[PDB]
Amino acid sequence: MAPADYFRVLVQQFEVQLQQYRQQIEELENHLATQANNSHITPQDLSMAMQKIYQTFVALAAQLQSIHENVKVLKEQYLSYRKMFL
Amino acid sequence: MAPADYFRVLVQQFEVQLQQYRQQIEELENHLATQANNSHITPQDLSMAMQKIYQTFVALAAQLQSIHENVKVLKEQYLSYRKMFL
Amino acid sequence: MAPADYFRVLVQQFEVQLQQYRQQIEELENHLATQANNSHITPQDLSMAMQKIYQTFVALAAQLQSIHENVKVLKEQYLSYRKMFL
Amino acid sequence: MAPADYFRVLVQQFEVQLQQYRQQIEELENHLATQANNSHITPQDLSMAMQKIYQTFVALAAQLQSIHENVKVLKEQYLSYRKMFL
Numbered sequence: 001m002a003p004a005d006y007f008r009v010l011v012q013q014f015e016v017q018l019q020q021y022r023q024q025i026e027e028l029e030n031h032l033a034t035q036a037n038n039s040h041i042t043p044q045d046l047s048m049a050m051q052k053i054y055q056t057f058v059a060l061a062a063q064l065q066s067i068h069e070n071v072k073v074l075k076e077q078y079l080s081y082r083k084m085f086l
Numbered sequence: 087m088a089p090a091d092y093f094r095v096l097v098q099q100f101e102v103q104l105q106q107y108r109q110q111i112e113e114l115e116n117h118l119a120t121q122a123n124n125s126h127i128t129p130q131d132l133s134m135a136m137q138k139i140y141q142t143f144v145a146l147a148a149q150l151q152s153i154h155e156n157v158k159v160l161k162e163q164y165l166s167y168r169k170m171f172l
Numbered sequence: 173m174a175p176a177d178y179f180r181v182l183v184q185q186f187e188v189q190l191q192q193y194r195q196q197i198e199e200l201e202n203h204l205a206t207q208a209n210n211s212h213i214t215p216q217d218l219s220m221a222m223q224k225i226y227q228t229f230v231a232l233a234a235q236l237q238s239i240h241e242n243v244k245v246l247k248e249q250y251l252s253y254r255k256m257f258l
Numbered sequence: 259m260a261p262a263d264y265f266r267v268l269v270q271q272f273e274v275q276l277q278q279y280r281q282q283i284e285e286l287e288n289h290l291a292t293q294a295n296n297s298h299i300t301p302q303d304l305s306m307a308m309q310k311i312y313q314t315f316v317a318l319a320a321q322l323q324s325i326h327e328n329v330k331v332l333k334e335q336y337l338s339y340r341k342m343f344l
Contacts, residue, residue: 007129008126010132011118011122011127011132012295014118014132014135015115015118015119015122015291015295018111018114018115018118018139019115019288021111022108022111022112022115022284025104025107025108025111026108026281026284028104029101029104029105029108029277030277032100032101032104033101033273033274033277036097036101037270037274040094041097043093043157043160043161046096046097046100046153046157047157049100050150050153050154053104053146053150057143060139064136064139067132067136068136071129071132071133074129075129098209101205102205102209105201105202105205109198112194112198112284115288115291116191116287116291119187119287119288119291119294119295122291122294122295123184123187123291123294179301180298182304183290183294183299183304186290186304186307187287187290187291187294190283190286190287190290190311191287193283194280194283194284194287197276197279197280197283198280200276201273201276201277201280204272204273204276205273208269208273212266213269215265215329215332215333218268218269218272218325218329219329221272222322222325222326225276225318225322229315232311236308236311239304239308240308243301243304243305246301247301
C-alpha cells in the first residue's frame with residue numbers, strides 16, 4: 001500500500017537477510033576453528049572455505065539487488081509526482 | 087621456513103580477517119536496529135548501509151585475494167618440484 | 173511520563189547495554205587470538221582473561237539490576253491500580 | 259603429554275567457549291530488535307531476555323570453572339615438584 005509501508009517491509013526484509021548472512025559467516029568460522037585445532041586445515045580446505053565465502057556474498061547480493069530495484073522504483077515514482085507538482 | 091609453517095600463518099590471517107569481517111557486519115546490524123528504534127530507517131539510511139556492505143566486502147576480498155596469491159605460489163612451486171622428479 | 177514511555181526508555185537502554193557487552197567480549201576475544209597465534213598464552217594470561225570476563229558480566233549485571241528495579245516498580249504500581257479498580 | 263600441550267588444549271576450549279557465548283548474545287540482541295520491529299518489547303519479553311542472559315552466563319561459568327580446576331591442578335602439581343627440589 002502506502003509508500004512508507006512497502007518501504008518498511010523492504011527494510012525489515014533487509015535486516016533479516018543481513019542476519020542470515022552473519023550467521024553463515026559465523027557457521028563457516030566455527031567449522032574452520034574445528035578443523036584447525038583438531039588437526040590443521042589443508043590448502044584444499046582453505047579453498048572450499050574461500051569458495052563458500054564468495055557464494056554466501058552472492059546470495060546476499062541477490063537480496064541486495066532486489067531491495068535496490070524496489071527502492072529504485074519507489075524513487076523514480078517520487079520524482080514523477082515531484083515534477084508534476086513543481 | 088617449511089611450506090607448512092607459512093601456510094598455517096596464512097590460514098592464521100584468514101581466520102583473523104574473517105572474524106574482523108563478521109564484526110563490522112555485526113556493528114552494521116546494530117546501527118540499523120538503532121536508527122529504527124530512535125525514529126525510522128529512511129531510503130538514504132538504507133543506501134549508505136547497502137554501500138558499506140560492498141565497501142566492507144571489497145576489503146575482505148583484498149584479504150582473500152592476497153592469501154589466494156600466496157597459496158597459488160606455493161601450489162605452483164609444488165608442481166615444479168613435481169615436474170622435476172615426475 | 174506515561175507508563176509505556178518510561179518502559180521503552182528502559183528497553184532501549186537495555187539494548188544499548190547489551191551491545192557494549194558483546195563488544196567487550198569481542199575485544200577480549202581478539203586480544204586472546206593475538207597473543208595465541210603470535211606466541212602462546214600463559215596460565216597468567218588465561219587468568220587475567222577469566223578475570224576480565226567476570227568483571228564484564230558484573231558491569232552488565234549492574235545495568236540488569238537497575239532495569240529490574242525500575243520495571244519492578246512499574247509492575248507494583250500496576251497491581252495497586254488493578255486492585256483499586258477490581 | 260607435556261603440561262604445555264594440555265594447557266594449550268584448555269586454552270583452546272576457552273576460546274571456543276567464549277566464541278559460542280558471544281554468538282548466543284548476538285542472537286539475543288537480534289531477537290530483541292526483531293520483536294521491537296514487528297510490534298514492541300513488552301515487560302514479559304524483557305524478563306525472558308533478562309533471564310536468558312543469566313542462563314547463558316551460568317553455562318559459560320560451568321565452562322570457565324572447569325578450565326579453572328584443570329589449571330589449578332597443573333599449578334598445584336607445579337608447587338609440589340617445586341617443594342620437592344626447592
